[PDB]
Design a protein around this ligand. Sequence first.
Ligand code: GK4
Length: 345
Amino acid sequence: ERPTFYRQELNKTIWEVPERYQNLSPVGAYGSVCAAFDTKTGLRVAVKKLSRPFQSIIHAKRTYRELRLLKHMKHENVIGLLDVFTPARSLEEFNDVYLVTHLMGADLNNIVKCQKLTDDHVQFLIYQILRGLKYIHSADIIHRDLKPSNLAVNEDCELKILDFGLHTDDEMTGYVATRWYRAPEIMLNWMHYNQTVDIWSVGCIMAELLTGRTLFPGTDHIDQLKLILRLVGTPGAELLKKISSESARNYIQSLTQMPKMNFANVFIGANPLAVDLLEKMLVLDSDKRITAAQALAHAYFAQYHDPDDEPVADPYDQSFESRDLLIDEWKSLTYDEVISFVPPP
Ligand SMILES: Cc1nnc(-c2ccc(C)c(-c3ccc(C(=O)NCC4CC4)cc3)c2)o1
């Protein structure tokens, strides 16, 4: 049965949401999002209204991608879908999509920036990121854009992963957090990349939680690459060969060879086990980085690691990515996914 919708204007656009959602207030950065009190579940929720979802093929495909991703993610440490609705009564008038998720009070960026983090806080926070990433990667999904701002956290330090990378050139330019957590292979388009790019991001985050400082705050791509290589050393012959970009390979070979630095001398006073894990994450060769599944079993997480409570994901069919469809087809697929949504228990 259809709920009653009511409307209000929240900064230049009309929100039409079901009555269960009250006290809407904008929170901007994450898209077009409102905090809301959900009266049926008693939860504080985030309601995102999609922005012109079917105005182009790329937009319509994006909207479907986003809904597909969110409907599949059911894990404590990954943002999931509480609800999805449109005020539209049929396909013909279907033109707006609204998404409802948990609203966690803060992001990791405000945590590291405002509070001192004990080594035990670091254990728990990274543990949770890895636990959710094992789940994410097990579905063959790559986040691609892991940074402190898309790690939501509550009062109890419980964490969910948000905003799967699904950026323009300018946004990646200069002295910007948008690029500081990016694996060098994506940053510079070295090769066809995979899910361990997400592990490099975790390395940078973990480092920053331990020291309270960005690990590689490059002023631009090249400066950042230098910051990276000073720490991990320049590529060996084996890696140079795996860079499929001739042009990128040729550039990296112009650099004075440097060895990998001693991580105990960079992360002074840190847990030796934390140092070890960092050395295994911040490996230049992605083939050799530690996987999230492998990381969870590392000694650093002895306290939180529970092999029976680190679930993988159901199969995720993303063959739609290969498909070229018409706006109307992408829109009909999105509609079918809206109409068949069943709330969680
Ligand atoms: C895909 C995908 N990845 N993330 C989303 C998504 C979709 C809808 C929403 C409302 C959100 C969302 C975005 C941010 C938060 C959130 O809790 N941010 C915390 C910052 C304010 C202190 C919660 C949820 C995220 O979708």
